Amino acid sequence: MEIVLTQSPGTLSLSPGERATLSCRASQSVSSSYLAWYQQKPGQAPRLLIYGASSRATGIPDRFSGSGSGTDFTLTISRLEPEDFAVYYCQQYGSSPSTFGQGTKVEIKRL
Amino acid sequence: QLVQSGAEVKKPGSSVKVSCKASAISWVRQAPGQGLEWMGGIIPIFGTANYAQKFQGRVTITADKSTSTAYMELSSLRSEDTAVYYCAREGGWLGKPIGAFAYWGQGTLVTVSS
């Protein structure tokens, strides 16, 4: 049975400088915290941010972090830069077949 | 370095074939309002295709080892197959187990239009 990943919220509306915390819930425990996070901006391929739940990819800024184990995982951006408004996906590779969440859009909050 | 074939516009029920030139990948699509989904991939060591149940029976994933090129052929196209299709690779490996996708192609837009 495929592990189903469900992200929350669907859309996060915040201003630059604010903290963002994104959630990914798994239908089943994710082995060995084998959970990754990606960023995707329009017209571009996804970019790996975090793997093994909490390990930052090389060249990824300090303001990105990940945490969690079992079924509950989070990606936090400590202070939002303009370039951080994008869609974010989680992915598990603790079981075959690999599965992805549906994405959370982080968008600029209304004025 | 993963370089994919150009965008395609297809009719309903037809098939599309996308290529990805590496200079054992997976195919992942971004379909509007459905996030990312893993379709299948060429697996390490055996170099044969595995598939997601959702697409089993109308996706065919092959690799030409000599030209380092992978293909995905998706048949009986439906409006919901409109999506950007990516090839992606994780990266002998004797380090810790890591199944995240570090490397991505530029994507191939397939539009299924009536």
Author numbering:
A (entry chain L): 0 to 27, 27A, 28 to 109
B (entry chain H): 3 to 25, 33 to 52, 52A, 53 to 82, 82A, 82B, 82C, 83 to 96, ...
Excerpt from the paper describing this PDB structure:
An effective HIV vaccine will likely need to elicit broadly-neutralizing antibodies (bnAbs) that target the viral envelope protein (Env) as part of a protective immune response. GEPs showed detectable, but extremely weak, binding to soluble Env gp140s and extremely limited neutralization potency, though some reverse engineered epitope-scaffolds (ESs) showed robust GEP affinities, well above the B cell activation threshold. Reverse engineered ESs are ideal reagents for studying the binding properties of GEPs. Multi-log improvements in affinity for ESs were the result of improved off-rates or combined improvements in on- and off-rates, with a small number of enhanced contacts to antigen observed in the crystal structures.
Five GEPs (1, 2, 3, 7 and 8) bind T117 with nearly identical behavior, including GEP 1 and GEP 7, which differ only by alternate J segment utilization, showing that the two incorporated mutations did not affect binding, so no further IGHJ1*01 GEPs were produced for study.
